């Protein structure tokens, strides 16, 4: 019969779905890691900013 052909069709379709979702688990793991490393990097960038602000101020406080 050829309905074996329709079965192999609609089976391996939904089986390729397997590695599509596995790749999505991996790539979206990485994408969230990256997003959060960016949030944190941004925190540090502005914290360095504020810290150096107040450091230069204290220095011009000692001499002046």
């Amino acid at each position: 019969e050829e309905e074996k052909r329709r079965v192999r069709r609609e089976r391996n379709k939904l089986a390729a779905a397997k590695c599509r979702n596995r790749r999505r688990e991996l790539t979206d793991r990485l994408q969230a890691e990256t997003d959060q490393l960016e949030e944190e990097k941004a925190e540090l960038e502005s914290e360095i900013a504020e810290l150096q602000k107040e450091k230069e101020r204290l220095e011009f406080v000692l001499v002046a």
Partner: protein, 68 residues
């Protein structure tokens, strides 16, 4: 035979299409993982400098507190 050649055209078409998609996916995962490694470096150093500045200012605050 034209029937056989037909079957083979479709086989080595689907297969070369898969070989294109495989590379387009793996280079993508690779880029992402290199960016994760790059940010986990640009953070070790950024936190080095940040905590260094923290120590420097908690020292300078004490210098001022001592001369009043």
């Amino acid at each position: 035979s034209q029937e056989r050649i037909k079957a083979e055209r479709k086989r080595l078409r689907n297969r070369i299409a898969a070989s294109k998609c495989r590379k387009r996916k793996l280079e993508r995962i690779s880029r992402l993982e290199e960016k994760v490694k790059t940010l986990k470096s640009q953070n070790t150093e950024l936190a080095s400098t940040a905590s260094l500045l923290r120590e420097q200012v908690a020292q300078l605050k004490q210098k001022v507190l001592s001369h009043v």
